[PDB]
Write a protein that binds this DNA or RNA. Structure first.
Length: 938
RNA sequence: GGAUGGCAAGAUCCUGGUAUGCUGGGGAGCCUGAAAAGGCUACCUAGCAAGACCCCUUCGUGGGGUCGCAUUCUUCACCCCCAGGGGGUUC
DNA sequence: CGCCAGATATATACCAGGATCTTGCCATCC
DNA sequence: ATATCTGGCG
């Protein structure tokens, strides 16, 4: 099913863009531009302000959820404990604002005598402290919090500042005490600071630490005389904090045994493996050499490295101080099978890092470690191996003496993971020692692998977790699968990168090399990071002329970034490059910028031009027939923020009062909403009212019959705060999220119909319960109470209630509006003078401003270039072309078009592209392009 | 230009916490007001996506145990990759 | 009052340290 | 950057 042709793939990776091109070569010149499209992705950013990524927002929301749940959990565990302890927490409703604080201060100043009344105040104070327990290093334990400066310097520092400003010192004094006083003298003072952006004096500088809070907790137990048993348990309960840990899914897999995770660097299996593998690859000059080490000599040097407690033995010392070899150069090492060989004799040989650090800790703190010193002396390393892997797994989760363990945390162990698992290291070590065999051949002996084999390269169908690299990668492999099915696999692949992009180079390249070693691609080249612009501007290929575009700045300049199609043409020109040719071009580039300068010319470059002279004309041909396409991937998966995060207070409106259109849309209860829906039209399905106009009179005796109960004219119904699409969450009102998509309805004559939009949000899908599997999210009648219908166009809702309006298509943020050679005809206002300078026919949907308008930006222009322009005219005016002023005033809002004045083009086609940047016309399972004018519903 | 040792810096996330914010329930103090009922500054408490399941059931119509804003062509379909995952779909 | 066009409202900000990566620098050996 | 808001406009 594949038409085989000789072609090469070109990739120009951008920060928010990726230009892809397939160019066929007859031997040996480019003839036909098979595909050339620049996809405009988002760089993986979720919040455009403070550019945090989508995944970051998910994880922050995710951990926020578990924090609340663990906080709920641990607070209830404390309450269950202090139940049998006899105490009483603060009730929520009716207590004094300062009950907990007065407690925390009284118990530390006065000893209350009566035992029963002491219990109630004990409960109040501990409840609030558990609700406000302060910060501490989560990696530490509760007993470690006990062994801290109590109180801290920062807390004493804060207390000194307050004494100087308000001229008062409080014995002793704890933090609970100071709060209850400072709210009295200068009322309205805030305890801990915060900023949400004027004139006030605050009470504290820094956050309170759990060590300072524990200081107050231990003082009160002293003053009130509490037994150790009760006080030790309640301290361990209020400061109970889950100990952080790495998940088992985020440790890499062993490439040799994917059933086991990578071992820790501090592992003893690892230290021995490194030393045993290094010696098995050593060779000694025996002639006319060389030969591997004799079994005896190998064992002798291994043990000398294992025993040392410092990294002193070098490779020169290995050859001389141990084997007594005559010269240092008589011993070498090889890192590949029968391959080149070197060895820095001044560099140090490996040693057992973990055992040496264990040695230094026992040698320094043997008093803290007497039993383990005696123990670890004669214990063999077969047990130490399991022990140290446990040490790595306790220092991150994931016989032991408790008394000793607490002092064992002042030892610094090797952090980080290593390539292989623990059992893989152990097995490879035994075979390199027992059969005297290479590491590369130890693989073959243990695990079925040919010799040699490099660890498998990451694939195209595997992510990197880095958001900008994964956006680029996703578009890339889709384009390549489409190209490899539509055409043959390429001859070469050339890639260009515009710093951060550093990971992207290695990740994309090594993934592409797996592709090539799988499909059979000869040459795979990457470049950093400006070879493609020179390749153009040395063949008279300037994109400001390739598409007829106006100048922008007062001085004439190359408007490279202006048109988003350049990424694709850069991809096209890269198909003519090979590593040697690209650098010999970049070198010439450097030779001009320094000083002189004369020409170009080299057998590689004259060959290039003779083969590449033709592209000067193909891009002209391709731009004329408009073959270069801008595309944006579509977001269809109905996941994301369901509603804005601000909870809001309801309004209320009595049943008997007068109702206006705005008040009826705002009715919260869906069943009460349907009640008033009948009271405005008994035979109507939808609300046909316009706000700011009464539609029901002030019936003194208005009633609403409901399945639950009927409300009298004195009863009140809850209303949302504002006449805008909202829902109810957890007893509050929340605005809808931004619109997931839009449904395109139409009615009227065939030859002159009226269209309008129904703006569908993620909130709509939730309350309509349309998030279950097996739902089409774009085509499913949304109940009339959903906010989509509540704020639809009044003309739209009148025609659909009349059976006249039918769903004809759907639009989504990012798809294309091609008005054809007809162009924008209903031009008016600032748009008119816009098209005189930027004759744009392709537009992209960015938003849905109201129930009657749709937001469009031009498909070919970049926001970043014109945003610079907007900042340009406000600080240095007169330094732009008249077209510059046009474009600067245009882009902030771009186009705010009335949907009726848009979809009325017969005329227009909304395009949905393939990966190759070609429009879908077939009504396949994938989304496809259609015409709003003549589209019909099945 | 390759090999090796070491150092330093940055990126992407992940885990567990803090402090606020908003809404509800509250009331310490205060200001506009003849009021009457607010709103002004703070503080106590509960929750912080909607929800889909589980688990234990002593059947409490209820307790605790997770998932829930990423993977940009949902749902349906058919070609792949190693019994669930991961991919691609040419106009 | 209808319709633009500019203005405005969105939860936010920290903490230590694991896992996964990349650069930049120094040096010694083919 | 988007869907609202307000205010000035005719």
């Amino acid at each position: 099913g594949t038409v085989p042709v000789t072609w090469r793939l070109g990739v120009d990776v951008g920060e928010r863009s990726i230009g892809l091109a397939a160019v066929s070569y007859e031997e040996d010149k480019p003839k036909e531009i098979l595909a050339a499209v620049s996809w405009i992705h988002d760089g993986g950013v979720g919040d455009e302000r403070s550019g945090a990524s989508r995944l970051a927002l998910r994880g922050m929301a995710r951990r926020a959820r578990r924090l609340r749940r663990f906080r709920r959990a641990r607070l209830r565990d404390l309450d269950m404990l202090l139940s049998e302890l006899g105490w009483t927490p603060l009730p929520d409703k009716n207590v004094s604002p300062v009950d907990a604080w007065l407690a925390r201060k009284r118990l530390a100043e006065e000893y209350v005598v009566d035992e029963t009344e002491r219990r109630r105040l004990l409960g109040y104070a501990v409840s609030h402290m558990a609700r406000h327990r302060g910060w501490r290093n989560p990696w530490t334990t509760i007993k470690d919090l006990k062994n801290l400066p109590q109180p801290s310097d920062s807390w004493e520092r804060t207390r000194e500042s307050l004494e100087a400003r308000y001229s008062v010192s409080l014995e002793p004094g704890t933090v609970g005490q100071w709060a209850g006083y400072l709210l009295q003298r200068a009322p309205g003072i805030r305890l801990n600071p915060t900023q949400q952006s004027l004139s006030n004096a605050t009470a504290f500088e820094t956050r309170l630490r759990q060590e300072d809070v524990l200081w107050e907790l231990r003082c009160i137990a002293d003053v009130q005389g509490l037994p150790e048993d009760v006080v030790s348990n309640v301290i361990d309960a209020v400061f109970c904090q889950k100990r952080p840990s790495v998940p088992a899914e985020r440790i890499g897999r062993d490439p040799l045994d994917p059933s086991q995770l990578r071992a820790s660097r501090a592992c003893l299996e690892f230290q021995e493996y490194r030393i045993v593998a290094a010696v098995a690859n050593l060779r000694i000059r025996d002639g006319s050499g060389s030969r591997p080490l004799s079994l005896e000599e190998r064992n002798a040097v291994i043990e000398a490295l294992l025993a040392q407690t410092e990294r002193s033995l070098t490779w020169s010392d290995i050859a001389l101080e141990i084997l007594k070899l005559p010269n240092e150069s008589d011993l070498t090492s090889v890192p590949e099978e029968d391959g080149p060989s070197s060895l820095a004799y001044s560099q140090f040989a490996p040693f057992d890092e973990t055992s040496a650090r264990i040695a230094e800790f026992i040698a320094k703190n043997r008093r803290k470690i007497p039993t383990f010193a005696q123990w670890w002396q004669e214990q063999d390393r077969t047990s130490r191996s399991d022990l140290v892997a446990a040490l790595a797994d306790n220092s991150i989760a994931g016989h032991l003496p408790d008394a000793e363990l607490e002092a064992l945390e002042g030892l610094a162990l090797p952090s980080g993971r290593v390539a292989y698992s623990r059992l893989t290291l152990s097995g490879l070590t035994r075979v390199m020692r027992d059969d005297g065999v290479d590491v590369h051949n130890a693989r073959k002996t243990c695990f079925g692998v040919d010799d040699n084999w490099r660890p498998p390269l990451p694939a195209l169908h595997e992510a990197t977790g880095h958001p900008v690299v994964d956006r680029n990668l996703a578009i890339l492999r889709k384009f390549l699968s489409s190209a490899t099915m539509r055409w043959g696999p390429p001859q070469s692949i050339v890639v260009e990168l515009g710093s951060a992009g550093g990971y992207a180079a290695v990740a994309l390249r090594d993934r592409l090399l797996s592709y090539g070693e799988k499909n059979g691609v000869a040459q795979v080249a990457v470049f950093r990071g400006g070879v493609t612009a020179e390749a153009r501007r040395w063949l008279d290929i300037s994109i400001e002329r390739l598409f007829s575009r106006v100048a922008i700045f007062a001085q004439s300049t190359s408007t490279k970034r202006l048109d988003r199609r350049h990424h694709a043409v850069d991809a096209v020109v890269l198909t003519t490059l090979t590593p040697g040719v690209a650098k010999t071009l970049a070198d010439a580039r450097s030779r001009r910028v320094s000083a002189s300068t004369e020409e170009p010319q080299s057998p590689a470059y004259r060959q290039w031009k003779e083969s590449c002279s033709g592209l000067g004309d193909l891009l002209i041909s391709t731009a004329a027939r408009d073959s270069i396409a801008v595309a944006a991937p579509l977001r269809l998966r109905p996941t994301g923020a369901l509603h804005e995060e601000t909870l809001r207070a309801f309004s209320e409106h009595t049943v008997g009062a007068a109702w206006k259109g705005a008040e009826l849309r705002r009715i919260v209860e869906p069943e009460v909403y349907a009640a008033f829906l009948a009271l405005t039209d008994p035979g109507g399905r939808f609300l046909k009212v316009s706000p700011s106009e009464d539609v029901l009179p002030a019936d003194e005796n208005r009633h609403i019959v409901l399945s639950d109960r009927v409300l009298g004219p004195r009863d009140r119904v809850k209303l949302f705060p504002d006449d805008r699409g909202s829902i109810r969450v957890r007893g509050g009102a929340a605005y809808i999220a931004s619109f997931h998509h839009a449904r395109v309805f139409r009615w009227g004559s065939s030859h002159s119909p009226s269209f309008a939009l129904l703006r569908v949000s993620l909130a709509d899908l939730a309350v309509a319960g349309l998030l279950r599997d097996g739902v089409d999210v774009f085509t499913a009648e949304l109940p009339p109470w959903t906010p989509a219908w509540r704020y639809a166009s009044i003309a739209l809702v009148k025609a659909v209630e009349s059976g006249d309006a039918k769903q004809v298509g759907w639009l989504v943020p990012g798809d294309e509006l091609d008005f054809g050679p007809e162009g924008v005809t209903t031009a008016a206002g600032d748009l008119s003078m816009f098209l005189k300078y930027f004759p744009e026919r392709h537009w992209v949907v960015t938003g849905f401003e109201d129930d009657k308008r749709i937001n469009l930006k031009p498909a070919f222009l970049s926001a970043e270039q014109a945003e610079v322009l907007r900042t340009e005219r406000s600080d240095r005016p007169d330094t732009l072309t008249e077209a510059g002023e046009i474009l600067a005033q245009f882009f902030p809002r771009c186009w705010r078009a009335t949907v009726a004045k848009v979809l009325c083009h017969p005329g227009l086609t909304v395009i949905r592209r393939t990966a190759l940047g070609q429009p879908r016309w077939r009504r396949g399972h994938l989304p496809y392009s259609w015409r709003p004018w003549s589209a019909d519903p099945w």
